[PDB]
């Protein structure tokens, strides 16, 4: 399976605009990820990381994005907060693994890398793995509004990038390797 292609990618999207890579019809070697020091966080939900090689799935979805370290914790089931609520949500259910690493020497810049954005205003929260990449000035009561007039605010903001690159493996013809 094309794991390195996702984890070692040179470019990641913003959280609000998270990208989904579908992994299927392949052998998933999780040993490379499992026992590596690459990740600062390796969190699985109801799934034993050590046993990932022994689990078959219809497919695996690797959701890739960059989020501030502080908000990495929001990428989990049963969470609230600006990311959990408006940018990227995980369902209240079992989940595969949320893998993340420090990218201060990759994405962060001395003046702040503001190339990455996030959502903070929306007419309701996101559904599990919903992607909202619209950009219409927020209006508190559904009315038409034009910025920078009163009550007219852009729903998106910028990240003051320390950033972490996060890849979430959501599980649904892909299995781990066999032992000879």
């Amino acid at each position: 399976c094309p794991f390195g292609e996702v984890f070692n990618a040179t470019k990641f999207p913003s959280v609000y605009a998270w990208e989904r890579k579908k992994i299927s019809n392949c052998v998933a070697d999780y040993s490379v990820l499992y026992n590596s020091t690459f990740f600062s966080t390796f969190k699985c939900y109801g799934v034993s990381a050590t046993k990932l090689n022994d689990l078959c799935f219809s497919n695996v979805y690797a959701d890739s994005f960059v989020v501030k370290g502080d908000d990495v914790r929001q990428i989990a089931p049963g969470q609230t907060g600006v990311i959990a609520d408006y940018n990227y949500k995980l369902p209240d259910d079992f989940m595969g693994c949320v893998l993340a690493w420090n990218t201060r020497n990759i994405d962060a810049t001395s003046t702040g890398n503001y190339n990455y954005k996030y959502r903070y205003l929306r007419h309701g929260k996101l559904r599990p793995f919903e992607r909202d990449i619209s950009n219409v000035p927020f209006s508190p009561d559904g009315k038409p509004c034009t910025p920078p007039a009163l009550n007219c605010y852009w729903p998106l903001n910028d990240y003051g990038f320390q950033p972490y690159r996060v890849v979430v493996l959501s599980f649904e013809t892909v299995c781990g390797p066999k032992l000879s």
Epitope: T80, L121, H123, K125
Partner: antibody, heavy 124, light 109 residues
Framework: QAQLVESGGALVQPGRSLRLSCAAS????????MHWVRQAPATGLQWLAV????????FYADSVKGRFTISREDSKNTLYLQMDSLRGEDTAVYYC????????????????????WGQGTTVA | VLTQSPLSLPVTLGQPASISCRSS???????????LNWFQQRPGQSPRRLIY???NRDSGVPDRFSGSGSGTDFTLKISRVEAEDVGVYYC?????????FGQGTKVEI
């Protein structure tokens, strides 16, 4: 033990400006959204405006939008209301209002509690 | 818009009371909750919250206070009105911006 104390109320002639202040204590001012609400027989309790914790966004009721400005000085833990072109209809007791629960400090959640009220200052 | 009823509720000291509040629109928010709160204002003083989310008491609020309701129709219930309860009860909705209050119900002793 959040506490709000309003001051700067006065009699204002039509068309004139008045600025109210509200001293906050018992909580970290910087970590909470702040609101102004006014009371009058005409409207009962009427919400006017909110300023977010970072002082960046400001939302206003149609009844005052374009005339009132909400602002805050974090360094003094003080909330202000700038009432320009004040009208007779603006006669009311102005309350400084906030909330104790800031676990969701984002729109519109700071309107859900509004459980912290000051003494209220009369403006006419 | 929130409308309370009756506007004036004369309650013999020690007797129960009930203040209604009807909204012009369902107060259920986008997350399925209902942000309909009740406040009590003593003459000469500010409003204080007693009930939140239609029926939940705030810490420090006497057990004589409760409530119920759904959709548009909500009620503030008092098992017995005390002399200290004299004042105006308000309903407040935060579900739809801008947040609004009812006209308030005066409860007399």
């Amino acid at each position: 033990q959040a506490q709000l104390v309003e001051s700067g109320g006065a009699l204002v002639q039509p068309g004139r400006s008045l600025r109210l202040s509200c001293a906050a204590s018992g909580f970290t001012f910087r970590n909470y959204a702040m609101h102004w609400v006014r009371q009058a027989p005409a409207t009962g309790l009427q919400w006017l405006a909110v300023i977010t914790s970072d002082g960046r966004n400001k939302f206003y009721a149609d009844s005052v939008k374009g005339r009132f400005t909400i602002s805050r000085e974090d360094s003094k833990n003080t909330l202000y209301l700038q009432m320009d072109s004040l009208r007779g209809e603006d006669t009311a007791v102005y309350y400084c209002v906030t909330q104790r629960d800031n676990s969701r400090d984002y729109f519109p959640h700071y309107f859900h509690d509004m459980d912290v009220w000051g003494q209220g200052t009369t403006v006419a | 818009v929130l409308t309370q009823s009756p506007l004036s509720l004369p309650v013999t000291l020690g007797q129960p009371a009930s203040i209604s509040c009807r909204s012009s629109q369902s107060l259920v928010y986008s997350d399925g909750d209902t942000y309909l709160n009740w406040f009590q204002q003593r003459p000469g003083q500010s409003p204080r919250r007693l009930i939140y989310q239609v029926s939940n008491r705030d810490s420090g609020v006497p057990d004589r206070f409760s409530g119920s309701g759904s959709g548009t129709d909500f009620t503030l219930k008092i098992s017995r009105v005390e002399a200290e309860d004299v004042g105006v009860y308000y309903c407040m909705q935060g579900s739809h911006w801008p947040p609004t209050f009812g006209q308030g119900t005066k409860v007399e002793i």
